[PDB]
Amino acid sequence: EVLVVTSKVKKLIKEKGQMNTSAETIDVLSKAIEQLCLKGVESAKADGRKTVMARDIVI
Amino acid sequence: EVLVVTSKVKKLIKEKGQMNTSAETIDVLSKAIEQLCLKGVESAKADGRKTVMARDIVI
DNA sequence: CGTTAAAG
DNA sequence: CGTTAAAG
């Protein structure tokens, strides 16, 4: 379910912008990781590989 | 440094694609979270808010 | 040691 | 910020 380290995302946002982070922001970041991983699976399989690589995460 | 839950990203990729996940893939996912959070800070500040919200993470 | 509760 | 879970 939760694919981001909430404490570290909040520490980064507080330190860089002096701002809080909503529960829903954490949810969007987790869903974003999920979709990157699933599209990374498609890309590695399309190339016949058994490993998702950095080049499979299109950003 | 590491903003993704590595064990859960690897579990997701293994379960969904029967594939391994490279060290460099985890690094790209962490860098992707970092850039989303920093762009989220810019968006919330531009709107004069003290909270990064779901609508500040443009995907 | 990051997450979840709830003491101060 | 101490307690409760569970990632590393």
Author numbering:
A (entry chain A), B (entry chain B): 3 to 61
The authors write:
Similar to its free form, HBb successfully crystallized in complex with a randomized 20 bp DNA fragment (20 bp-GC50) within a few days, yielding the two distinct crystal forms HBb-DNA_1 and HBb-DNA_2. These could be processed to a resolution of 1.95 Å (HBb-DNA_1) and 1.85 Å (HBb-DNA_2), and solved by molecular replacement using the free form of HBb as a search model. In contrast, HBb-DNA_2 reveals a complementary DNA binding interface. Here, the asymmetric unit contains a 9 nucleotide (nt) long single-stranded DNA fragment, which forms dsDNA fragments via crystallographic symmetry. These fragments are bound by HBb via an additional interface of the minor groove. The crystal packing in HBb-DNA_2 markedly differs from that in HBb-DNA_1 in terms of the arrangement of the HBb dimers and DNA, containing only short DNA segments. The superposition of the HBb-DNA_1 and HBb-DNA_2 structures illustrates the location of the combined HBb-DNA binding interfaces, resembling histone-DNA complexes found in eukaryotes and archaea. The engagement of these interfaces suggests that the DNA undergoes bending upon binding with the HBb dimers.
